[PDB]
Design a protein around this nucleic acid. Structure first.
Length: 110
DNA sequence: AAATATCGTTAT
DNA sequence: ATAACGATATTT
């Protein structure tokens, strides 16, 4: 977050995360209204944080070797269509799938 | 160099 | 409005 002059990546703090979870319980998916309550956040930032990190359906367990194996197979099947591929991974979104491909492609020496 | 949450931008 | 994906910045 904020500085280092202003960081070009502003990370959500644990407190903002708590805030966001409350705002969603209160306003649902009205991202503009939600973001109005965050002085340094816009609608896009709140939506992304919720959808990919805070939503109760998101997995916070490490990637398993079975999941990795599925990813290599699904990418042979679908190519770089991350949103489609993420359908097959309960608790993971396209954001997670495309990050994981970088890491997997490293292990495979690609 | 590697890992990964965030951001620029386009297409839906 | 927001889903989608490349690409980046930050930290290790």
């Amino acid at each position: 977050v904020q500085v280092n002059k202003a960081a070009k990546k502003q990370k959500f703090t644990p407190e903002e995360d708590e805030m966001l979870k409350r705002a969603v319980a209160q306003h649902g998916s009205d991202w503009k209204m939600i973001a109005a309550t965050f002085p340094n956040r816009n609608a896009r930032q709140c939506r992304d944080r919720w959808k990919n990190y805070l939503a109760p359906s998101i997995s916070h367990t490490p990637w398993t070797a079975e999941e990795d194996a599925l990813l290599v197979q699904k990418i042979q099947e679908y190519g770089r269509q991350w949103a489609i591929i993420a359908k097959f991974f309960p608790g993971r979104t396209d954001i997670h799938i495309k990050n994981r491909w970088v890491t997997i492609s490293n292990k495979l020496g690609i």
